[PDB]
Amino acid sequence: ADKNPGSENMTNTIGPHDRGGSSPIYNILNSYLTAYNGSHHLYDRMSFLCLSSQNTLNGACPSSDAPGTATIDGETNITLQFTEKRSLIKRELQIKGYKQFLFKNANCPSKLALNSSHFQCNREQASGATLSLYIPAGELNKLPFGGVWNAVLKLNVKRRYDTTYGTYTINITVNLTDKGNIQIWLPQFKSNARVDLNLRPTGGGTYIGRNSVDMCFYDGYSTNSSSLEIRFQDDNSKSDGKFYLKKINDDSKELVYTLSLLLAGKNLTPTNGQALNINTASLETNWNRITAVTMPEISVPVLCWPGRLQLDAKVKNPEAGQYMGNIKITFTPSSQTLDNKQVEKNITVTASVDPV
Numbered sequence: 317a318d319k320n321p322g323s324e325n326m327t328n329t330i331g332p333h334d335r336g337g338s339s340p341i342y343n344i345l346n347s348y349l350t351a352y353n354g355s356h357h358l359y360d361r362m363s364f365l366c367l368s369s370q371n372t373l374n375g376a377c378p379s380s381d382a383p384g385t386a387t388i389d390g391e392t393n394i395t396l397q398f399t400e401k402r403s404l405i406k407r408e409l410q411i412k413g414y415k416q417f418l419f420k421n422a423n424c425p426s427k428l429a430l431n432s433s434h435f436q437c438n439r440e441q442a443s444g445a446t447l448s449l450y451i452p453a454g455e456l457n458k459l460p461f462g463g464v465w466n467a468v469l470k471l472n473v474k475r476r477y478d479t480t481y482g483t484y485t486i487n488i489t490v491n492l493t494d495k496g497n498i499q500i501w502l503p504q505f506k507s508n509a510r511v512d513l514n515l516r517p518t519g520g521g522t523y524i525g526r527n528s529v530d531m532c533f534y535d536g537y538s539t540n541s542s543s544l545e546i547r548f549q550d551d552n553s554k555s556d557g558k559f560y561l562k563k564i565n566d567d568s569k570e571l572v573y574t575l576s577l578l579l580a581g582k583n584l585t586p587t588n589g590q591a592l593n594i595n596t597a598s599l600e601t602n603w604n605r606i607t608a609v610t611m612p613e614i615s616v617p618v619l620c621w622p623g624r625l626q627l628d629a630k631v632k633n634p635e636a637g638q639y640m641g642n643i644k645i646t647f648t649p650s651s652q653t654l655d656n657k658q659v660e661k662n663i664t665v666t667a668s669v670d671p672v
Contacts, residue, residue: 319444321351321359321473323482330451331491332654335536335612339456344411344449344488350473351481352418352444361434361476362415362445364484372397372408374470378431381476388429390414394449398490400463402538402601402619409455411469417442434476447471449486460615462494463538491652494536497614500647500661501532501606513561513573513629513667521633523669525573528627531661532604532620533579535649539601539619543650544594545658548575548586548625550641557587561639561667571639571667573629580621596621596650627665639667 330342351359366377377394394411414427417434424437427448434442449469459465469486502509513525535541552560552570563569577584580599584592602622608614643663649656 317352318354319349319352321362321481323473324484326484326486328486328488329491330488332493332652333456333491334496335456335459335462335492335494336496338454339451341453342451344451344469344486345447346450347416347446347448350415350445350447354420354443357441357443358475359444360417360442361478362417362442363432363474363476364413364415364430364447364471365474366394367470367472374468375411377413378429380431381474382429382431382433385433387426387435388432389426390429391427392430394469396467396469396488398459398465398467398488400461400465400538402463402540403461405460405463405616407459407465409458409467410452411449412452413447413449413471416446416448418444418446430471447484456490456492459490459492461538461618462492462497462536464540465490465492492537494612494614495656496610496612497534497536497606497608498647498649498656498659499534499536499606499609500645500659501534501604501620502661503530503532503604508664509661510664510666511627513627513665515629515631515667515669517671523629523631523634525629525631525667526626529625529663531623531625531645532602532606533623533647533649534604534606534618534620535656537649539596539599539621541649541651542596544596544621545591545646545648545650546579546586546594547589547591547646548577549589549644549646552641553589557590559588559641559643561641561665563635564638564640566635566637569635569637569639571629571631571634571669573627573665573667575643576626576628578624578626580623629667631669634669636669636671639669641665
């Protein structure tokens with residue numbers, strides 16, 4: 317059908333793609349018709365130019381008509397800046413671009429650089445042209461961490477050495493997950509987290525203690541997840557929502573403690589085995605130098621939801637000795653409904669009742 321060139325606004329959503337795998341080719345435009353007319357030949361030399369030759373804000377690539385009359389065969393390299401939604405971190409990816417001409421009586425489907433001079437097919441003038449844009453295989457692998465990476469590609473649509481018809485504004489959104497790196501990060505412990513309750517006698521057989529453990533909940537997605545499920549649980553599940561330390565060498569002797577959690581500005585009170593479901597929108601985030609669980613690498617600090625877990629004990633007439641228990645923390649960040657895996661972290665909790 318006939319088509320008159322002009323400005324257009326487009327949207328592309330890439331993904332979700334997980335950083336654990338190599339990224340495949342992503343088609344942004346495939347032989348998209350930019351212009352065509354069956355009677356005249358005003359569209360016999362369609363060209364596409366970036367707005368700047370080096371500034372990647374909206375895509376950097378040749379910003380004027382190629383000066384040589386020689387046809388430039390092949391594809392144009394476009395360097396495009398992507399900004400991660402939450403972190404505001406900027407990185408550049410390559411987009412490949414090319415045009416193809418349409419002729420009424422013959423076929424010359426050579427790919428031409430966006431900038432190229434026009435040519436005739438068997439002495440015939442083109443009647444129109446298509447535009448193709450894609451992200452080459454492997455480009456996303458360059459990105460440093462999971463998140464929502466956005467770019468706005470801009471190309472002016474032109475009749476070579478003549479009228480500029482308008483601008484194509486192409487919004488590209490890359491949903492880059494990093495599932496293998498979803499984790500509960502503990503700044504003070506690479507492994508085997510342990511806290512002692514620091515019990516001290518206050519007289520009358522009463523013992524009081526308090527300590528805390530810092531953690532950060534990381535979704536491998538720059539905190540773009542809209543909700544999280546979090547739970548704290550211990551061995552001694554006796555079904556009363558309480559947490560117990562047991563005397564080493566004497567399981568029958570127990571010691572009760574309680575938990576409170578400052579989760580990114582929200583004060584919570586976790587009870588044994590009760591899952592907490594929190595909407596993410598109002599939660600604060602912190603930057604943490606969180607490392608990869610295995611691979612792929614997280615090369616630069618990432619956003620996460622910080623939590624300070626406080627353990628309190630006020631205990632009456634406990635028997636002297638060493639006590640120990642475990643807290644199993646589980647975490648599941650929401651998803652657009654794939655439905656992420658649950659991850660965990662274990663904290664060894666101890667306490668000494670020492671009347672000295």
